[PDB]
Amino acid sequence: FELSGKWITSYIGSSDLEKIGENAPFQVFMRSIEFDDKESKVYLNFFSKENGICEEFSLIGTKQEGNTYDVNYAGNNKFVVSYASETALIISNINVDEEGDKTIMTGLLGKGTDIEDQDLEKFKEVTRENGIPEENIVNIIERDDCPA
C-alpha cells in the first residue's frame, strides 16, 4: 500500500470559505507527497496562486503522535491521511492562522484528473462528518491550470 508519490488535488472542503477561494492560501494544487518514516518527516510539493499567478512550494512536516503531521504554512497545521485506496487519499487538516482563527478542511487527492466515484463518495462523507456543508466543497481539478 504505497502512499508516497504523485498526488493531484481534485476537491477541497472548508469550514471557513475565506481560506479556499481564488488566490486563498488553501486552494492547493498538490503535485506530490513523500512520507519519510525513518526520519519521521513528510515532503509536500504543490502550487497555489497569489495575484492569480502560480507559485510553487515544497514544505517539510514532522510526524507526531497517532499518524498525524505538523507543518507550518499560512499558520500552524496538523493533518492526517484519513483514508487511502489504490486510487486516492483523503486528507483532514486543522489550521490555526496568524490571527488565531481555526479552520477544519478536507482534500481528495488522486493520480490524475479522472476521478473514481467510490473515492468521491468517501470524500463527501468525511467532509460531512467534519461538520462541513456540501456547499463548502470546491472542485479543484476545474481550477488547476498550473504546471504539471
Ligand X SMILES: CCCCc1nc(N)[se]c1CCC
Binding site for ligand X (CB under 6 A): 9, 12, 26, 28, 44, 71, 73, 77, 79, 91, 93, 107
**For residue 135, with 0-12 CB atoms within 10 Å meaning exposed, 13-18 middle and 19 or more buried, which class applies?**
exposed
Cell of 44: 509536500
| Nearest-approach distance from CB 139 to ligand X, in angstroms | 14
Q: How far is the CB of 32 from ligand X (least distance, A)?
A: 11
Q: Judge whether 75 and 96 are in contact, CB under 8 Å.
A: yes
Q: Which is nearer to ligand X, 12 or 137 (CB)?
A: 12
Cβ proximity to ligand X, 91 vs 126, nearer residue: 91
When the beta carbons of 73 and 116 are compared against ligand X, the nearer one is 73
Question: Could you tell me if 93 and 78 are in contact, meaning their C-beta atoms sit under 8 angstroms apart?
Answer: yes
Residue nearest to ligand X as judged by C-beta position: 107
Give residue for cell 499560512.
74
